[PDB]
Design a protein around this ligand. Structure first.
Ligand SMILES: CNc1nc(C)c(-c2nc(Nc3cccc(N4CCCNCC4)c3)ncc2C#N)s1
Lengths: 252, 313
């Protein structure tokens, strides 16, 4: 139903992985790395950032049910991306996804003879995994992403091409870096991204003439207390991430 | 074996009887083992399917999940097997193709009105939600034991979108059963929309009296011939710019024909309003063809005898 894929913090501590002894910190990486592998493959497969984001959410959700100890991220990412491309209508071929995943995971290694038994096996493994993903997610594949909501909001507040692009950037990075997707509705995450991008640009959105703050035009539930708590959490991890901030840093 | 909270084994249902031997995939009537709830099972076919789970099935599932309406069949859940996959639907007692092909079964004008009303209402809903059904036919219309009509079989359905930028949509031309297929498609259109479903609505409406598909072509050319013998012949006068399919010439369509829609059906139908509505559904130019909204407003639904419930039968 509606609260099915949103979890309390307390629920996030008791994840399938913990259960099997994976520290919270360790688990987080595992996620960030899967998101990285997705981003890398997706770019070479030439699929949209939207499709990559979809596979990332699939991955996030998958691991609220399954454990990294049983299903390693290097196995799941390709299957997830394979699925997300089919769903987002940018289908990429099974053999092609296999190839690209191989070079990413094993840059030096040499692709197996497609005639081989070893290769036929990995083809079959991807298909099996896609099916385990479909079933774990219970066939719920339509994903709402913050980005839809970002665009709408950043137009309504007449942000510069720059501010808007920075907010879209925050959105994409929230998926790679955080479990916000498992906790907050996309529209709320969109507000968090726009807020942070403002802070980072020194931009301030003028309080409407009604005395209503912008986010109130966006989500009823949202409060500034929540926004500051969240932008802080997001900014912290951006700071840990080598070179990420450099990308939005005003070098002048 | 592995954690699977949200995908139940289909064994929770007990198979009663096949009910779809030759219509697409195998379809079963079944019974929930605890509650007795009757449902329909459809297995997802895997005939290579060398590309994992069929992209076609993903599309249908996505669409079934989106569409929630009294006149649209309801996907309850998807079940695994322990390997296959099944779409589980609420069961519907009747099928309009069946009821119509049954000499015992009889409709009053009042009920026929009601049927058309529900059908048109279902179309209005799916279109409003940017979905084209693409397989309008009697056999894909169901009716529940309580007389509620449901649009079924979204296996060829597809989302659509508007314009844009003067770049035409390039949707698939190979859509819709031949007998129910609109002129546009037969003339090679790939930038079509909701009007194709309404053409089908027309064919079905007429079928409510004739008890048989009005235009049973054998090939596209035969179909186009039949359509011309009924709706007049395809003329840039009748259908502005029709002349610009690279298939206008190749078709070499008949050109003496004049519109006989109301004359040829005059016999069976009788009711003036019914004939008028059918005439406005079976219009050649998709752009002059009535839409579900206007159709629902048509005097056919607002004159005596007013539309009534499906009692008995
Ligand atoms: C057209 N393909 C279909 N798939 C499903 C799952 C269908 C369906 N069918 C019923 N009940 C029902 C009752 C009487 C007859 C039939 N069939 C036989 C005659 C022609 N072929 C198809 C219809 C089916 N209830 C719910 C669903 C659903 N979804 S029909």
């Amino acid at each position: 139903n509606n609260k099915r894929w949103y979890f309390t913090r307390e629920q996030l501590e008791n994840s399938p992985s913990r259960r099997f002894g994976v520290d919270p910190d360790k688990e987080l990486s595992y996620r960030q790395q899967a998101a990285n592998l997705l981003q890398d493959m997706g770019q070479r497969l030439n699929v949209s950032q939207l499709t990559i984001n979809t596979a990332i959410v699939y991955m996030h959700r998958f691991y609220m049910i399954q454990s990294f100890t049983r299903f390693p991220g290097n196995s799941v990412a390709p299957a997830a991306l394979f699925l997300a491309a089919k769903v987002e209508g940018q289908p990429k071929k099974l053999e092609h996804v296999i190839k690209v995943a191989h070079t990413c995971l094993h840059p030096q290694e040499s692709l197996p003879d497609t005639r081989s038994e070893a290769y036929l096996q990995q083809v079959q493994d991807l298909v099996i995994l896609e099916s385990i993903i479909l079933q774990t997610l219970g066939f719920e594949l339509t994903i709402d992403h913050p980005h839809t909501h970002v665009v709408k909001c950043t137009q309504l507040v007449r942000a510069s091409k720059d501010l808007a692009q920075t907010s879209y950037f925050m959105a994409t990075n929230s998926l790679h870096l955080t479990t916000f997707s498992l906790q907050y509705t996309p529209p709320v995450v969109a507000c968090v991204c726009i807020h942070l991008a403002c802070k980072w640009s020194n931009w301030e959105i003028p309080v409407s003439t009604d005395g209503k703050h912008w986010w109130e035009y966006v989500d009823a539930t949202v409060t500034l207390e929540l926004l500051d708590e969240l932008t802080h959490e997001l900014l912290q991890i951006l700071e840990k991430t080598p070179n990420r901030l450099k990308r939005i840093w005003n070098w002048r | 074996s592995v954690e699977c909270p949200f995908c139940d084994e289909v064994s929770k249902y007990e198979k009663l009887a096949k009910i779809g031997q030759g219509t697409f995939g195998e379809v079963f009537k079944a019974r929930h083992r605890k509650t007795g709830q009757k449902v329909a099972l459809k297995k997802v076919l895997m005939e290579n399917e060398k590309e994992g789970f069929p992209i076609t099935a993903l599309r249908e599932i996505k669409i079934l999940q989106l569409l929630k309406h009294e006149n649209v069949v309801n996907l309850i859940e998807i079940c695994r097997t322990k390997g296959s996959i099944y779409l589980v639907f609420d069961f519907c007692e009747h099928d309009l193709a069946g009821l119509l092909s049954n000499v015992l079964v009889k409709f009053t004008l009042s009920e026929i009105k009601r049927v058309m009303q529900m059908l048109l209402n279902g179309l209005y809903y799916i279109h409003r939600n940017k979905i084209l059904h693409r397989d309008m036919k009697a056999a894909n219309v169901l009716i529940t034991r309580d007389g509620v009509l449901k649009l079924a079989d979204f296996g060829l359905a597809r989302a659509f979108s508007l314009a844009k930028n003067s770049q035409p949509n390039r949707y698939t031309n190979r859509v819709v059963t031949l007998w129910y297929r609109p002129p546009e498609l037969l003339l090679g259109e790939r930038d079509y929309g909701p009007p194709i479903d309404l053409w089908g609505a027309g064919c079905i409406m007429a079928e409510m009296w004739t008890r048989s598909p009005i235009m049973q072509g054998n090939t596209e050319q035969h179909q186009l011939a039949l359509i011309s013998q009924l709706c007049g012949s395809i003329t840039p006068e009748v259908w502005p710019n029709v002349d610009n399919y690279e298939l206008y010439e190749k078709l070499e369509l008949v050109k003496g024909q004049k519109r006989k829609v109301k004359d040829r059906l005059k016999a069976y139908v009788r009711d003036p309003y019914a004939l008028d509505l059918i005439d406005k559904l079976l219009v050649l130019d998709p752009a002059q063809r009535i839409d579900s909204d206007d159709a629902l407003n048509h005097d056919f639904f607002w004159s005596d005898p007013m539309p009534s419930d499906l009692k008995g039968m």
